[PDB]
């Protein structure tokens, strides 16, 4: 019933797996893009996975073939199944919802994000 609150993170050893989830604000299909950004202390924000309203997915190089972004319309929830975790994946993960609107005279781009969740992959 709570939204824009990333859950499912924690501490796991290398090779482990986690599954992060985030509920959307209303109809998750009204969304235009859903992404899972991550940032480690001392490092810059980086996009890890991004699904479009059509299902087209994009991934990063380090996470390709390991992390899997996905969506459930019934539960209005975006999912990131992280697998074969490596210590270089330790960071705080944020979920972002991008909404595009416009007409022949204007263009609006809303971005809503959550508080994040920590992921610690131990060596």
Residue extents of the structural domains in the chain: 10-116
CA angle 102, 49, 64 (to 5 degrees): 145
Return the percent helix, strand and coil in the chain, to nearest 5.
Answer: 0, 50, 45
Look-up: residue for tokens 């991008």?
98
Label each residue of 9-67 as H, E or C: CEEEECCCCEEEEEECCCCCCCCCEEEEEEECCCCCCEEEEEEECCCCEEECCCCCCCC
| Other CB atoms within 10 A of residue 64 CB | 10
Please, what's the b/e burial string for 93-111 (b: 16 or more CB within 10 A of its CB; e: otherwise)? bbbbbbeeeeeeeeeeeee
Which tokens hold the place of 33? 């893009």
Instruction: Tell me, in Å, the resolution of the deposited structure.
Output: 2.8
Tell me how far apart the alpha carbons of residues 71 and 108 are, in angstroms, rounded to a whole number. Answer: 24
Residue 87 phi, psi (nearest 5):
-55, -20
3-state secondary structure of 88: helix
Which tokens hold the place of 23? 């509920």
Method for this entry: X-ray
Cβ neighbours for 118, distance < 8 A, ≥ 6 positions apart: 9, 10, 91, 92, 93
Q: What is the CATH number of domain 10-116?
A: 2.60.40.10
| Other CB atoms within 10 A of residue 85 CB | 21
Instruction: Please answer whether residues 83 and 67 qualify as being in contact, where contact means their C-beta atoms are separated by less than 8 angstroms.
Output: yes
Closest CA to 20 of 59, 67, 75, 87: 67
Tell me how far apart the alpha carbons of residues 84 and 25 are, in angstroms, rounded to a whole number. Answer: 31
């Amino acid at each position: 019933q709570v939204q824009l609150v990333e859950s499912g993170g924690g501490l796991v050893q290398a090779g482990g797996s986690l599954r992060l989830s985030c509920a959307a604000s209303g109809s998750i299909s009204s969304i235009s893009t859903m992404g899972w950004y991550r940032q480690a202390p001392g490092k810059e924000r980086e996009l890890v996975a991004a699904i479009t309203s059509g299902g087209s997915t994009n991934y990063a190089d380090s996470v390709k073939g390991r992390f899997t972004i996905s969506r459930d319309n019934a539960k209005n929830t975006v999912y990131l199944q992280m697998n074969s975790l490596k210590p270089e994946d330790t960071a705080v993960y944020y979920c972002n919802f991008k909404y595009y609107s416009g007409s022949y005279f204007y263009k609006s781009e809303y971005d809503y994000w959550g508080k994040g969740t920590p992921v610690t992959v131990s060596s």
